[PDB]
């Protein structure tokens, strides 16, 4: 797992700092605004990451604790195959497609569930067609 030094070769710390200044109150940043900044930096935190940092430092992070959080958000082991296999689990006809409604159920049920409108919006933004090529979808979100 990325340390802060390595994080700072991957992202511009000038951005890291400016995004912190945008959201900080009292010299600290809330987990939710830290996750927002992580995403602006092209990182993808889950609730596992949020809860890990919260367990160490509480709801509001100093600048350095925010840097530690970002290092946890890097996820270098992410690959498209694992994402595809998750969806393919529900593709028992082995068609390569799931409908927007099927995709919605898969995304709003278990895990860090999206809201119905979040899942709907992400799916409509991806494709105007109802059949989603989930391999194409996974390749898109990973970039």
């Amino acid at each position: 797992v990325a340390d802060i030094q390595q994080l700072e070769e991957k992202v511009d710390e000038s951005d890291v700092r400016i995004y912190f200044n945008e959201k900080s109150s009292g010299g600290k940043i809330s987990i939710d605004n830290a996750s927002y900044n992580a995403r602006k930096l092209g990182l993808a935190p889950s609730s596992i990451d949020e809860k890990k940092i919260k367990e160490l430092y509480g709801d509001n992070l100093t600048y350095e604790q925010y840097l530690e959080y970002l290092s946890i958000c890097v996820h270098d082991k992410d690959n498209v195959e694992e994402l595809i296999k998750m969806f393919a689990h529900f593709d028992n006809n082995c068609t390569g497609y799931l409908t927007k409604s099927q995709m919605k159920n898969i995304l709003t049920t278990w895990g860090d569930a999206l809201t119905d409108q979040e899942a709907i919006d992400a799916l409509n933004a991806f494709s105007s067609e109802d059949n989603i090529d989930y391999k194409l979808f996974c390749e898109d979100i990973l970039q």
Partner: peptide, 18 residues
């Protein structure tokens, strides 16, 4: 089932829609 990979999908979706 396959919960950790589900978390990554949802994570990247939230990243994309930020």
């Amino acid at each position: 089932k396959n919960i950790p990979s589900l978390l990554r999908v949802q994570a990247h979706i939230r990243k994309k829609m930020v």
